A paper describes a structure:
The cryptophycins (Cps) are a class of macrocyclic depsipeptide natural products derived from species of marine cyanobacteria in the genus Nostoc. Cps destabilize microtubules, thereby preventing correct mitotic spindle formation and inhibiting cell proliferation. At high concentrations, Cp-1 and Cp-52 destabilize microtubules and cause the formation of curved tubulin complexes and rings. Cp-1 and Cp-52 bind primarily to a site on β-tubulin that overlaps with, but is distinct from, that of maytansine as well as those of rhizoxin and PM060184.
Therefore, we have determined the structures of Cp-1–[name] tubulin and Cp-52–[name] tubulin rings, to a resolution of 3.4 and 3.3 Å, respectively, by cryo-EM and further characterized the binding interactions by molecular dynamics (MD). In our Cp-1–[name] tubulin and Cp-52–[name] tubulin samples, we have also observed the formation of rings with 9-fold symmetry (C9) ranging from 24% to 40%. We also solved the structure of Cp-1 C9 rings to a resolution of 3.8 Å. Image classification indicates that the majority (ca. 2/3 and 3/4 of the Cp-1-bound and Cp-52-bound particles, respectively) have 8-fold symmetry, most of the remainder have 9-fold symmetry, and a very small fraction appear to have lower symmetries (not shown).
Numbering used by the authors:
A (entry chain C): 1 to 436
B (entry chain B): 1 to 429
Write the structure that this text describes.
Amino acid sequence: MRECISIHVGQAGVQIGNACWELYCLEHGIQPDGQMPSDKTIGGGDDSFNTFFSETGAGKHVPRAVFVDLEPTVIDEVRTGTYRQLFHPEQLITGKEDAANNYARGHYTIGKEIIDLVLDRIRKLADQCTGLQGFLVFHSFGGGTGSGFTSLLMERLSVDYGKKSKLEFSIYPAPQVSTAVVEPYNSILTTHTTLEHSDCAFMVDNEAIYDICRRNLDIERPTYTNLNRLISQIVSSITASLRFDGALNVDLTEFQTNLVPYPRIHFPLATYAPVISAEKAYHEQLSVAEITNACFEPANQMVKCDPRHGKYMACCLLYRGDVVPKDVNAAIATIKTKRSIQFVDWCPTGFKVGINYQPPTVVPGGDLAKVQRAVCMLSNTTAIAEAWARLDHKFDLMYAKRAFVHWYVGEGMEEGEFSEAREDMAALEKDYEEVG
Amino acid sequence: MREIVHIQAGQCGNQIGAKFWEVISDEHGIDPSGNYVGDSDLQLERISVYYNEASSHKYVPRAILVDLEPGTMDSVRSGAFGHLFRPDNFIFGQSGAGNNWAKGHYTEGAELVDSVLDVVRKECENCDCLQGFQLTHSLGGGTGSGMGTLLISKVREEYPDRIMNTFSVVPSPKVSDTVVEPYNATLSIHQLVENTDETYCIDNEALYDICFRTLKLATPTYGDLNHLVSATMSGVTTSLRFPGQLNADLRKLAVNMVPFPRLHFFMPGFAPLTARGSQQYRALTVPELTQQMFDAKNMMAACDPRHGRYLTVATVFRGRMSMKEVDEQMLAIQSKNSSYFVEWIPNNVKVAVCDIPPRGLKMSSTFIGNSTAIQELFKRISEQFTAMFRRKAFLHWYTGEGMDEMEFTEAESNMNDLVSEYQQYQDAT
Ligand SMILES: COc1ccc(C[C@@H]2NC(=O)/C=C\C[C@@H]([C@H](C)[C@H]3O[C@@H]3c3ccccc3)OC(=O)[C@H](CC(C)C)OC(=O)[C@H](C)CNC2=O)cc1Cl
Ligand SMILES: Nc1nc2c(ncn2[C@@H]2O[C@H](COP(=O)(O)OP(=O)(O)OP(=O)(O)O)[C@@H](O)[C@H]2O)c(=O)[nH]1
Ligand SMILES: Nc1nc2c(ncn2[C@@H]2O[C@H](COP(=O)(O)OP(=O)(O)O)[C@@H](O)[C@H]2O)c(=O)[nH]1
């Protein structure tokens, strides 16, 4: 009974959106034509499922969300596809020319041209809402129409709705799928003006996710329809508390407050150890305990880092059906082994556990299948310093000789802000190495 | 995506453009009169980049045939694909343009660049989105370095926003009819470098060297050389004609490949070295191909990759072959000799694969590189020109047409500045 807003920026933000929203709709059984067995045929709903859908005179439950993309490719496919019909008509916006791997075009030449139409759509659609907790945004680092449009859009939104929130689900650069090498410049050049408005972010490192899909999903070509299905499952798990119905981690405010140790440092790691091979029939059997028994290993996390070499802040979870909280507290006893766990002196610790009773509903025939149970660790661990450190290393190496600088300099922003942003992230990593 | 304008001038660009267009139109497979010959829709998904619909939903390209020797019209119409070009872009001067600047660079044809600009504008208007310009010519003699560079000046004056690509042809003592070339060369770069975006040093020297040493042709005429060039440039275009992971685009190609706003002298190469043979012959396999990518014989410019560090590396692959193994090979090449890839930029190499095989062979690769190594070509031009200029020669021609000598001196200074800059950028860490 608490609405929200979703948004998808770039061709990477729209792809994730597409691979996720089928999971959302099928999860409730919402087909393009389905009757949604819990309705009233006019606005019937207001359970947690409808907290993201607005119903027309047809009881259509059209998503309160937009897809944004200046270069038209994936969006055109959405238009041909049934998904656009499911979506609110004309909500989506189609562009004409991307910035193409240069933050400034989406921040100083191209993004500003249509950013007003974007925010106009935002306002008009938003005033249809009453109980919005905040913003759920999808983007990543690559170009100015996928990283800069986000920065500008956050600026405008944070101005417009001082009370509201915004959660970030961003995709981290990886050398393995390099479609540029300006990308680290993009990432820094955004995050240096994102913390000031964002309050809670999520980075899913495709590098690690690639490592997952290559090894343990038995797909040997990482197509932008493999990683995306897996990552879309990640999104369904994390959104599960809010999205399905009442449990722990009710609110986005609740996310912040149970993961923020400090307003600046809002980078929570996400964890999802329980996985399956494929539509393959049978491999073994697995219960609720063993899965968190194996949720410790450093190679079962969405971002490469050693959680054993750091301390946590708070750790929520979710579980799917098949309730047995007694064995959950038994797992709590088991995890005292401390061989990969350690906490902070002044702050009280909570392994908050909430339950939801739905087995994992998924796509008909994807690279994954039915299982009985799972659990996802949301640790805002200080260990994420490793990723920022590596990215700084790469950044300094490329910036020692003013690489590509003109490809930004002549595009409407000066050079020196590179240095101040670099020292900004230097302050942030200082804050990590201090905490503890 | 958007639309691009194709420009061909001189003789190499006029004839060489004809053969290139032949190759691409055949592989994309549309009838000479425009009947749909393509056998899969993926062919026609992007073909709007370089072909436009006629009044009856029928492809007509968007290209501009410019020259000043009147004989080019008949020589082009006498090729296989010579008819299909638009019968209004054959703008030709009739008084001949013997290989001397400032007759076309300054004296005449400056009258005609207004006409070519008018026609290119009225052409691009119907282009729903304009993406840039495709200019092919040869850095040799008058036309191809005269009208072409003036046209670059004009288009950069009128269309700053879009990008500009050049396919450049460098003559050399082996196959060189005329004599005044080095003068023309340096005169041309001294405008190119300050008025272009990225380049294609399609060397004749090493390319003849291939045709004569290993490809074993003792009589390489304008037949064979256009063969190789049409193959190479068509391959360069395929990354664009197809969809792909590295869907590199003009602006994107630049920004991924151009480290500093000057040093954009690319070094295209080709791994399956070929004749105009009726047979593909040589089976070529990918582990071998990756090794072949850097082969000195393979390259289309006069340089040693081993003696050079690459500023950026781009690769394109073709055919039905395993994607994973290629990546494995690429990681392997990077590891053995770290120095060949520059320390400044990590992970410079970018790899994509294209579904359709090149028409003729089974599986190959199309190199697009940029090392500091490109400096060897510019050093040969430097040496040759400065030798011919230490004492005067023919200088009355250019001077009496309205040139001077300070322009020559400033051009040579510009050149040696460029080569010094390359040398410096290949010695940092
Ligand atoms: C990072 O490290 C940690 C972080 C958090 C925790 C405990 C963690 N957090 C707090 O900071 C507790 C209290 C203060 C307050 C904060 C400081 C101000 O917003 C408050 C507010 C004001 C008006 C209305 C609603 C809320 O939050 C809350 O009221 C929310 C309840 C709502 C958001 C579901 O919090 C919870 O109780 C929910 C059920 C989740 N959990 C917690 O019990 C432990 C550690 Cl170690
Ligand atoms: N969907 C998707 N995108 C990915 C994946 N891995 C990387 N990407 C990113 O996808 C991005 C492409 O979208 P953008 O970043 O918006 O690209 P752009 O050049 O700014 O603009 P467009 O190409 O028009 O979207 C690149 O930055 C890649 O880094 C993946 O697994 N899925
Ligand atoms: N026609 C032609 N010329 C080439 C080719 N490759 C190199 N060249 C050289 O390019 C120069 C021709 O210059 P050209 O464009 O004819 O000058 P113009 O007389 O002003 O048109 C000569 O030095 C040729 O040796 C090629 O494939 N075709």
